[PDB]
Design a protein around this nucleic acid. Sequence first.
RNA 1: AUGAGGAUUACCCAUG
RNA 2: AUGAGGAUUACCCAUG
RNA 3: AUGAGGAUUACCCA
Lengths: 129, 129, 129, 129, 129, 129
Amino acid sequence: ASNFTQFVLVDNGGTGDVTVAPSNFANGVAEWISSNSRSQAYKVACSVRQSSAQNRKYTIKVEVPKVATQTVGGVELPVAAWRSYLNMELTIPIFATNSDCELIVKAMQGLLKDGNPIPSAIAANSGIY
Amino acid sequence: ASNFTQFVLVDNGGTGDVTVAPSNFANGVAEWISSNSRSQAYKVACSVRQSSAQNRKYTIKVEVPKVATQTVGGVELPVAAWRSYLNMELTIPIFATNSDCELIVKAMQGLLKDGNPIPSAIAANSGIY
Amino acid sequence: ASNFTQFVLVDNGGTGDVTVAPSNFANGVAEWISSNSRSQAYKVACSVRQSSAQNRKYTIKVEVPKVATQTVGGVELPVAAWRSYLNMELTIPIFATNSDCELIVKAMQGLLKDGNPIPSAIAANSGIY
Amino acid sequence: ASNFTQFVLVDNGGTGDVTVAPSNFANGVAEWISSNSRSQAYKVACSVRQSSAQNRKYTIKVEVPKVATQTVGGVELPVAAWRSYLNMELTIPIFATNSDCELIVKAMQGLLKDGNPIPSAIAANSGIY
Amino acid sequence: ASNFTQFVLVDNGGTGDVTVAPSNFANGVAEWISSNSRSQAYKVACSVRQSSAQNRKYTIKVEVPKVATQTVGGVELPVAAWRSYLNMELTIPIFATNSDCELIVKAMQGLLKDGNPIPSAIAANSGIY
Amino acid sequence: ASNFTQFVLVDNGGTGDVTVAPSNFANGVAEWISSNSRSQAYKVACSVRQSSAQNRKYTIKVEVPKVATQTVGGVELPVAAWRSYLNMELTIPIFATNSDCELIVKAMQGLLKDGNPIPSAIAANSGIY
RNA sequence: AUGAGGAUUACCCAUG
RNA sequence: AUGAGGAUUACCCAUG
RNA sequence: AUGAGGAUUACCCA
């Protein structure tokens, strides 16, 4: 393979989708950003490393812009009021086969699937109740 | 409503789906576990807190076990050979609209969608390249 | 352009070939790992450095596992019964042109070509006689 | 039977081939040197030893000279302007059968096969990128 | 894509053009060198870092050698009589759009265009006056 | 000659080009600025000096305005969010002839030519990958 | 607060 | 961080 | 830096 390619991060049904493309590879950390200024870009970074003798660990970081009332190309301060940060760490024991790993991926997809508790709480500015 | 409902964590297409159900809300940490002995159960935990004055932070944790039967003291016990841990923290500014939040959910869904770079690396015990 | 890609480490006809894919390029050490359990995987690591004022030194490392299943208390895990370790260091003066480097590479390929003294002693659990 | 024989180190078609012939097998170190001035000659040395209770370790060494003439005071001598040094150590557990050793040899030949990442970085005065 | 490709550094109009090719990406520093012994090679290095919280900084270095052959110890070695060094650092705010960035690239191109003040002073061993 | 003259810094094909004209010469440092306020001007400064016994050194500084969403003639703070800074230092050994210097100029032009890695990374808000 | 810090994973570490 | 600070050029210096 | 020094292999030793 060669997985370092462009992909659709936000699928808005073909029209107005957000595609994110390879942008940096310094230090084995793959980065992908959207076609925007860096203050307004959708950003994704990923890396794997053997965290310890028994585990491998993926660190995935995502940055998503606050879009409501955004001024395209404008200087928007404070930076913290306009951006959301996602930080995921996936620890996987060295015994995990490809199949085991495929299941872990399904568990992550199910967790965020539409209609499930977590993605619905987040989308509605809520917690669990 | 009450978004504290059960959902299918691992969709194995109707047969051998792993569903997870509400199991505890003590200390403001919503927990869900599968129908197993607590030693072999999948587990999902979620909590939200107003981390800063202008942010809110969601902490989500998923544990995927590799089930086994272990002979301890000449007796067999339901056990987990190992566990894979997902730990994510999402920081969203208080200025984020519900539609801004839906954009964050869509970004996390596309990130893990089948065939995209990251879920591909993971499922194949590989890095991005 | 990129030479940090996947490649065939063990050519077994076109089936049973061992392929090693990029995994991590941290701190000037490029590492490649084969697929499936990291515990049973092949590993190749490589780095270059200016060893001294006139020399550049390459450090290559390869691990060939003896795949096996470990069973303990009824819990079986995929492991490497043992590993074979190869460590090589190649020093090249800064005066070497590209033609000199190509020759160094041919000297290395010839040393290990089938039928020559060295690869034949190794493949037979033997020394020189 | 004997594997302490002459062989082609650098295969240059069938002309300009560098052949290295047995020279001395003192103290368990088999050495091979190419013809003509010892000062401009290629050298290959090899030895095996029981590194520990379970391991046997091979130590291979190769030297590729940069042939040149030294002129001092009108007296010219055949010398090597500089040398490239290769040092490798291969550890193999005593549990390795002949089939395991053959595989180790294929792993070594593949690592250096033309076009693969390592031989290509070297032949081009480069690292991994 | 992968913008890590070879390019012609000195366009001598098809004949005696100096092209430079990707040669290392260790430590997040993209490097390119020409086909010479590392002692006589042209070299280009580039790296980007988020210097401040609101800036990004590119560090670019070019080395142009004056090639010579030097007799050291009565032996001739490929050498560089001297080297000319270009060191540039470009700081761009995170609020810069892609079109803002293209304006920076156009400004640097016009600056060095033939016949403009600066490239004229340099080429004539002169100052601006 | 007399090179201290007006020139086109940004060439937008005759229509809407940015011309920069001599503006200061205090201390042997030639300066050129566009026709704007100093907070929004395109600025260029240049000077040569014998850095040491063996080298002469050119220090070239450029400032480029963030134009997207700019308000012409307006007060835009913070200053750092609206401006990019280029700082080049060219060290040239005293042995460099005019011809040697012309080549150094070509190397600088080739580096920034359109389509080459560096100017493409910069223009796309990217690094090398 | 931060860390491509670690975990046996709602714990621990470091720095600030 | 800054320097029309230096270099043998991914290093060193000074100040802050 | 070297070592036909060792390894659980980018670690440890003289």
